[PDB]
Amino acid sequence: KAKEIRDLTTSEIEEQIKSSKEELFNLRFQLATGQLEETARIRTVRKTIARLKTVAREREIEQSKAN
RNA sequence: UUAAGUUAUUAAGGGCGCACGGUGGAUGCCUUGGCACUAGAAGCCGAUGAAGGACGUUACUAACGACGAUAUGCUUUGGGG
């Protein structure tokens, strides 16, 4: 993905962001209710969201390099 | 059967020697933090938030980094294995 995340159509990114945020919410919710036992997913979901915002920022800058 | 002389026999204490304590840094070490030389800057920012912080962020959490809700980091170019 993280290459062709840049190939996504700027609404797949938007829906992808909120799907990933619901996934992170469920993970944090079941870490507390103590049944997770694979705690490394939390970190990588965070970084995915980071990935997804970064490219969605830079489209914006290139969207105003022309205008 | 008398006059006389004398010593230990506790070492409570004293000096010597012995042997384990407490103590803390004499020896060696350190070189993590500066005296000074050379060179480079440029003294150094921002009304694009400038100037030190406060709260936070790790799967687990107690001070500095990141700076930061994209948070114990994100993308990209080049090194590197």
User: A34: how many CB neighbours lie within 10 A of its CB?
Assistant: 7
Please state, in angstroms and rounded to a whole number, the distance separating the CA atoms of residues A59 and A48. 17
* CA atoms of A5 and A22, how far apart (whole Å): 19
The two structure tokens encoding residue A54: 């970064």
Report the alpha-carbon distance of residue A32 to residue A15 in Å, rounded: 26
Long-range contacts of A33-38 (CB under 8 A, 24+ apart): none
Cβ of A59 near strand B (under 7 Å)? The reply is no
- Range of the structural domain that residue A27 is part of: 1-67
How many whole angstroms separate alpha carbon A10 and alpha carbon A4? 12
Chain-centre distance for alpha carbon A27: 14
Number of domains in chain A: 1
Residue A43 contacts strand B, CB under 7 A: yes
Cα–Cα dist A60/A64, whole Å: 6
DSSP type of residue A35: -
Q: Is A27 (CB) below 7 Å from strand B?
A: no
> Rounded distance, CA A65 to CA A63, Å?
6
